[PDB]
Amino acid sequence: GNWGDQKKAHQARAGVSQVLNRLTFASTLSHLRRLNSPIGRDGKLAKP
DNA sequence: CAAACACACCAAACACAAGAGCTAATTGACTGGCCGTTATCGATGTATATATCTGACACGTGCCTGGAGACTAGGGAGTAATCCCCTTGGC
């Protein structure tokens, strides 16, 4: 899932590729059609 | 003019970002030099297989010696008569 080179993996993004959650058809669909913002996790701001 | 401290500004870092609880899955180093084992290539044979030449045995052909065949020449071996020497026989 590290969208970058192996040597500098930590410098690249994380979670870009995830394991498809095959727990129930609805979950599969939701997963295949999901988004994710690059903003840092748990940011103090609340506009985004 | 040089030195004391004070203020405003600029530049440089520190540490924090609730309590946790469960589950899943990606990473399982790598060229090179060198020593140490071992596999392979090579020589240096001696053992066995096959080919050439020599020796002994076998079948076959042969040159040579002696033997054998037909025919001949002509004389050696050989009937038929004869003599009478000599032997066997006698008193």
Residue count of chain A: 48
Q: Would you give the distance in Å from CA A1 to the centre of its chain?
A: 8
Dig out the tokens for A4 from the structure.
């970058």
- CB of residue A33 closer than 7 A to nucleic acid strand B? no
A13 within 8 A of A20, measured Cβ to Cβ: no
In three state form, how does the secondary structure of chain A look? Answer: CCECCCCCHHHCECCCCCCCCCCCHHHHHHHHCCCCCCCCCCCCCCCC
| Residues with Cβ within 8 Å of residue A32, at least 6 apart in sequence | A20
A18 within 8 A of A27, measured Cβ to Cβ: no
Q: Which nucleotides on strand B sit less than 7 A from a protein beta carbon? A: 17, 24-25
Round to whole Å and give the CA distance between A36 and A3: 14
Nearest to A2 by CA among A40, A14, A23: A14
Dig out the tokens for A5 from the structure.
């080179």
Determine phi and psi for A39, rounding to 5 degrees.
-60, 150
Experimental technique, in short, is cryo-EM
Q: Whose C1' is closest to the CA of A1: which nucleotide?
A: B26
Round to whole Å and give the CA distance between A1 and A21: 15
